[PDB]
Amino acid sequence: HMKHPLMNVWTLWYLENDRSKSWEDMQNEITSFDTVEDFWSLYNHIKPPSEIKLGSDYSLFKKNIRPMWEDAANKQGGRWVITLSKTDLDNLWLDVLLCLIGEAFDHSDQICGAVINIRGKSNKISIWTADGNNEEAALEIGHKLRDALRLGRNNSLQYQLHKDTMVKVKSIYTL
Amino acid sequence: RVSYDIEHLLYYSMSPHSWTLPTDWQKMQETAPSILRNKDLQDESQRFDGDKYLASIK
Numbered sequence: 291h292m293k294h295p296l297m298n299v300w301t302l303w304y305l306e307n308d309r310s311k312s313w314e315d316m317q318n319e320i321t322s323f324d325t326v327e328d329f330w331s332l333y334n335h336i337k338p339p340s341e342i343k344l345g346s347d348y349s350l351f352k353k354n355i356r357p358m359w360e361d362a363a364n365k366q367g368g369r370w371v372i373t374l375s376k377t378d379l380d381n382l383w384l385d386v387l388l389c390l391i392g393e394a395f396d397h398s399d400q401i402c403g404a405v406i407n408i409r410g411k412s413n414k415i416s417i418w419t420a421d422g423n424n425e426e427a428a429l430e431i432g433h434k435l436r437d438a439l440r441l442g443r444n445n446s447l448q449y450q451l452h453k454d455t456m457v458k459v460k461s462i463y464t465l
Numbered sequence: 466r467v468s469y470d471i472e473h474l475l476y477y478s479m480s481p482h483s484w485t486l487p488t489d490w491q492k493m494q495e496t497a498p499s500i501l502r503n504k505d506l507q508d509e510s511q512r513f514d515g516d517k518y519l520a521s522i523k
């Protein structure tokens with residue numbers, strides 16, 4: 291007991307690299323947590339992004355929201371994409387996780403989750419939001435990220451609608 | 466709003482409860498063994514150091 295409660299319940303998903311399954315089937319629900327200490331409990335006992343296989347993902351989403359386009363919470367939504375050192379990547383991922391659970395965003399209801407893609411060429415870190423046409427919320431979330439993650443002008447920050455993504459990229463907001 | 470800044474989140478990382486195994490550890494071992502680490506609680510050599518992580522930022 292005596293653990294510090296979080297505002298929301300979060301679920302960690304692990305996209306496995308298994309071509310014998312469809313993409314949706316690859317999504318493995320690891321566990322959920324709703325206190326700060328339980329988050330660190332999970333974090334201290336799962337491998338950082340820089341240590342897991344290529345083609346796999348880590349996704350942290352609010353309870354009852356799946357990390358996929360099909361989920362009702364994401365249908366009308368989009369993502370702030372950050373295009374990308376092992377230490378640099380792990381720490382950036384952690385800082386995003388701490389922004390989420392710490393509720394650093396004023397438009398909290400618009401937050402769905404965050405996804406980190408681990409690929410051979412490069413690695414993406416994305417923050418998914420509920421309504422892509424809600425520019426006020428999207429921009430506010432965008433500014434919090436750039437400020438919190440201390441993103442320099444070196445790297446870019448672009449918002450992409452899920453509908454434009456699945457049709458194969460158009461970025462409607464940039465910061 | 467129930468919120469926490471990075472300072473406090475990092476501080477709570479050095480609690481004992483932040484090192485003990487997750488509740489679903491058994492099921493995690495059964496469904497996703499490839500991503501698990503630090504299985505020996507006696508060894509905290511690779512435990513996350515929040516105080517240093519906070520100090521490293523300046």
Ligand SMILES: C[n+]1cn([C@@H]2O[C@H](COP(=O)(O)OP(=O)(O)OP(=O)(O)OC[C@H]3O[C@@H](n4cnc5c(=O)[nH]c(N)nc54)[C@H](O)[C@@H]3O)[C@@H](O)[C@H]2O)c2nc(N)[nH]c(=O)c21
Nearest residue numbers: 307312313314316344345346357358359360407409414458
């Ligand atoms: C988020 N999402 C992804 N897929 C699925 O995963 C692929 C890679 O995504 P991705 O998110 O890894 O994209 P990128 O690598 O950045 O580039 P991107 O341009 O999107 O990647 C295309 C490349 O990925 C290859 N690819 C196709 N299926 C997969 C897969 O299951 N896993 C991986 N790692 N690569 C795949 C494909 O052959 C091509 O070379 C997408 O193309 C969707 O099929 C989803 N499917 C459903 N139903 N719902 C979703 O919400 C969803």
Ligand SMILES: [Cl-]
Nearest residue numbers: 468469470473
């Ligand atoms: Cl606080």
